[PDB]
Amino acid sequence: LAIRESIESEIRRERERQTNPSAMEVEEDDPVPEIRRDHFEEAMRFARRSVSDNDIRK
Amino acid sequence: LAIRESIESEIRRERERQTNPSAMEVEEDDPVPEIRRDHFEEAMRFARRSVSDNDIRK
């Protein structure tokens, strides 16, 4: 999810800097370095227990 | 567990006030009113999921 956010943010940078050649001066850093708690909150929805209870009982 | 603690505390009161008739003057309140977090921490060991995963799958 973090990689998706980074690439989808950079596409906007490319489109805006080619659409607007006005200044192109600020040269900012990455929008998403150092993966945040939001990505874990999204990714925690799709987790599951792969081992059932009867297996552990066995 | 709270009831066990209360009765086991009152047995000490009876034994000490009959063993020592010295003053018997203070007339305190209950040792255990208003069940505390310790009883939940003890009772949470014996809990279990009564419904397995294959049943919910069904």
Angle at A14 between CA A22 and CA A4, to 5 degrees: 145
Q: Are A52 and B49 an interchain contact pair (Cβ–Cβ within 8 Å)?
A: no
Collapse the DSSP code of B39 into the 3-class scheme (helix H, G, I; strand E, B; otherwise coil) and give the result.
Answer: helix
Distance CA B13, CA B16 (A): 5
If you compute the radius of gyration of chain B from its CA atoms, what whole number of angstroms results? 20
Token output for A1: 């999810």
Q: From the CA of B46, how many Å to the nearest CA of chain A?
A: 17
**Dihedral sign, Cα of residue B45, residue B48, residue B53, residue B57:** negative
Method: cryo-EM
Q: Single out the residue of B12, B54, B4 nearest to residue B32, CA to CA.
A: B4
**Residues present in chain B in total:** 58
- Contact residues, chain A, for B53 at CB < 8 Å: 49, 52-53
CA–CA separation, B18 and A36 (whole Å)? 66
Interface test with A, best of B49, B52, B58 (most A CBs within 10 A): B52
How would you label B9-31 residue by residue, b for 16+ Cβ within 10 Å and e otherwise? eeeeeeeeeeeeeeeeeeeeeee
C-beta separation of A56 from B52 below 8 A: no
As a whole number of angstroms, the distance between CA B43 and CA B1 comes to 8
Tokens 């010295």 -> residue: B22
On whether the CB atoms of residues B39 and B1 are closer than 8 A, the answer is yes
With CA atoms as reference, the chain A residue closest to B56 would be A52
Gap between the Cα atoms of B37 and A19, Å rounded: 63
d(Cα A53, Cα A55) in Å, to the nearest integer?
A: 5
Q: What are the CA-CA distances from residue A12 to residues A20, A28, B51 (Å)?
A: 12, 13, 49
Contacts of B54 in chain A (CB under 8 A): 52, 54
